[PDB]
DNA sequence: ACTCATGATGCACAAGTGGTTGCGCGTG
DNA sequence: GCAACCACTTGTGCATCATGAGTGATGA
């Protein structure tokens, strides 16, 4: 089962405790768990509608040269496609 | 709308795609911020309940009510595996909204011919080297007990461990001998796993075939198939390996989880529950 | 032929030797374990391990419920881990003749939308609590089939038109604009469930449907620890404050 | 290749930038990367001897029935095995 | 000890286990906090250098001395892929300590018979059906030239695009035709990848067999094997699929990367380089 | 037959029309592209894309070095894309006869430990920079083989007992407890290297070892921006401030 | 008696900002 | 000129505590 990582901050405590039912929490806001496509997709959909006004970022295995892809929802660090290679972009104030 | 704490069956991993069991003792299971948190004295552990089929409760586990509500919603079954056997079971709503398995099991148990056929199939699974085309229920039970005791004797001479000519049963099986504790721990782990699988599949745990009388009869009927194949040899190996000062329960549970993973006991259990009920 | 239904809430159950201990804000209630029957552990309950050990040692059906059994959350083994109701129900539902007979027996026995929906859900919870206490399977239903709780639906159909409808109409009459109706409907339904007569009716109907002989039938006594202390003092229930 | 996740805080900026060469950074202190076993062990050895006085937690795929394992060094959320199963333990004051 | 910014060859992935390339334009590659950072106007992007084999630098690109040192130590090669082909190359110390490959390549390039035989192997890998066991240098070179023209013509006819009878050559090849820009992008990516692999393996880019005279002769020789197999058809597909007002270079590079991944061009390239030197 | 090896440090390089624009703190310099033979880019340098394109169009070797070429970090193509040196080296190293002849020519022409090692490392860096500028392969070594940087060791052994040893001895003599000996050794080595005579001798020894005819040899010109302003002004190098 | 939501109050850590020191990474 | 180091401020959001509000997750 491909690995899935979700990072949260500035989100309601309900979601912060809810994700611990599916994946563990190695450190504050970051959650790691092994699922399949369906479970990971459903859990990302759940995170989408419970994060509210927060920041969420997901990392999971993909079919690129690096081997992973990112999904972010209103997150500070967006992802920019460098010709099929996903990289993290940090905008400057 | 997604609400924290309530999830559909699809958002949850399938029965065969999750872990086996967790043993909790001297703790306080609780739900804070919609997380099943085990409030041990030193600190708190949050359980990934969606990845675990059954949750074992040892001595001193003060479990709240919303914790049980959350565990039942998740699909993680609860079993109070105290000293000397399993003391109590608990289960929420089934992970399956369809009762094809349940109605088929009811049809098979309401008929004497189907009951004897299912008992024959169970015996063939436990011992495939015999011919059971003309056996009866009482004969099946007697033979089952006879070679269960024979397997116990074989494993007792194999690992050089004393055994007081007994067969394990969850009712009143106690002793200071480490073999007793190892057998108890391995067997309660197996029974909790079987109970969780049966509850998740929608099957009624009281519609047993070999065992009748108590509402956990089917749990026994499914656990005895793998009792002598894995859990009993694992307990005997634990008793042989355990040294002075070793927690027999902890090491026995570790070894039985290792054997459950190695033997693929839970996927095998689902396949068996499908084959016995005869769904094409 | 007695089956007491002790409903616990807002308490912490621990075990003194052969006696559970319900410690509410009113005080500490000590009950002999041999008389528990069915325990309906409500919200705000911290059930201990020794307590469930003692309760399961005496065939006590622990059912985790909500406000007076509005919702069903989990259950343990049945009354004296009995299978007679379960086996009888399975035998009667499998073959067509007895299933049709039981369906005919059920038929013979038998804002606003939100109020009805909440009342139906509360009735489903109470019916599921009673069923899981007795030992029946919620899936083996006669009129309804194919679902995990088809039997729960079928049993609640008896009380659809005489419990949920009056409560829903009362809520609709008492409803205020800008207020959630399901909340009021659930609160009124649990208020109706407070007395316990409805639970007695459900137990009697469940035992009547399966053609259980009247001699072997057991009756329901929905005890209340503090409201019915006179009926409990001579039975061995110590009270403390 | 298994996905390795390393979380850092209270570590020198040198390590924070250095570990980005191998494996990306999706959040403050949260890193994700795909390595084989040997590369992951070498990177963890680098993390151990560079963070000085700080917190380091690494999560990698393993062969238990959860699907992952944790190895942490001087981290707040220690890992406790629940009979062969890794769980996150958060000590209280 | 371990120092931030430095890493031994063992701490680095194998050459065939890395990503192919990344393109950077109108930016400022920089090293801050020991990380290769690409300081765009609107933000900053940190390059996972240890997983990328070669780095492509476009127009309006500033790179710092420490950034070049860091990329070279990490093993990533630097190629200045401006307009009109590759403008410059750059690389650091190789991550392959042993020089067996380089010594074998030198021995193979000093002997005229060895040069002719290795050129035969390259022509065989580029075109396996034909037999060239009795060809000389001029006969070979003219024959690959004719085959490349034929492949260009047939691929142009396949995708129905105008081709003005040209062949790519990084020696002053410029054009504003969208097909020309797409094929130039694919080819500069290919040459950068070849340079990265050759530098990583320890081979000298100046010891060529078919091409000779310039310091990158071996790079052209190795890229001959793969320029007509994948890069040209993918470039033609990009030109055919291009729409009005589209960045041809970005989509051409994306499709080139997709073709490199699908064709396993990196493991194939290292295997072909190993077989060319007859290393068992 | 003339090659100018201009070393750039603490400056930015950009192109305006055909001449690179050094933007050091002292002032702005406008060396034409054709004037530069090899650009030894040093620490604190932001080489631009336009400057790289212009330098590569005119066959300039960009070598990223340390302070005065003590360390070699990365390099581009050779001087005017020359492979004749590399081809001759490969031919002379392949067979045993030429290898032995060149090695014999090598020997014919050929705290304290910490300083010696640092000086050897700096000498290796300078040799590698010169070799990468000329186009030779560091792997193809005569005395040393089996390492990716063997030829660098062989060439540095020419100067091992003539440059590194006196510098290391001077550093050891002028040292105290608690001082980083490697730092002093590297600083003194770059102080020795700034003169440029060592680099000219190194290039000449490279061609001599390669058995290149004296007619075809190239003489090195270690030019400087402001130290040799009077020499650079007549060749079209603008100076600003 | 539980759990959640919430308004405080305290706080630990990352972020930018201002000079300062050094050009570094050290076997054949 | 580039980049690391360090010191100093600014500030974001996690974690805690005390109080009031609920018993909730809503299908023939």
Residue numbers in the entry:
A (entry chain D), D (entry chain A): 1 to 93
B (entry chain F), E (entry chain C): 4 to 283
C (entry chain E), F (entry chain B): 20 to 129, 181 to 311
Paper text:
The natural Cas1–Cas2/exonuclease fusion (trimmer-integrase) catalyses coordinated DNA capture, trimming and integration. The Megasphaera Cas1–Cas2 retains the canonical heterohexameric architecture, with two Cas1 dimers (denoted Cas1 and Cas1′, a or b subunit) bridged by a central Cas2 dimer.
Cryo-EM was used to solve 3.1 Å and 2.9 Å resolution structures of Cas1–Cas2/DEDDh complexed with prespacer substrates with and without a TT PAM, respectively. A 23 bp duplex sits on the top of the complex, while 5-nucleotide single-stranded 3′ overhangs extend into the clefts formed at opposite Cas1 interfaces. The DEDDh domain could not be resolved in the PAM-absent dataset, presumably due to a high degree of conformational flexibility conferred by the 38 amino acid linker between DEDDh and Cas2, and because all 3′ ends are buried within the complex, protected from exonuclease activity. Dual Cas1 His29 histidyl residues measure out a 23 bp DNA duplex by π-stacking with the terminal base pairs of the double-stranded region, clasping the prespacer strands and marking the start of the single-stranded 3′ overhang. In the absence of a TT PAM, DEDDh trims prespacer strands to the integration-competent size (28 nucleotides). Loop 7, helix 7 and the C-terminal cap are absent in the PAM-deficient density, suggesting that these structural motifs participate in PAM protection.
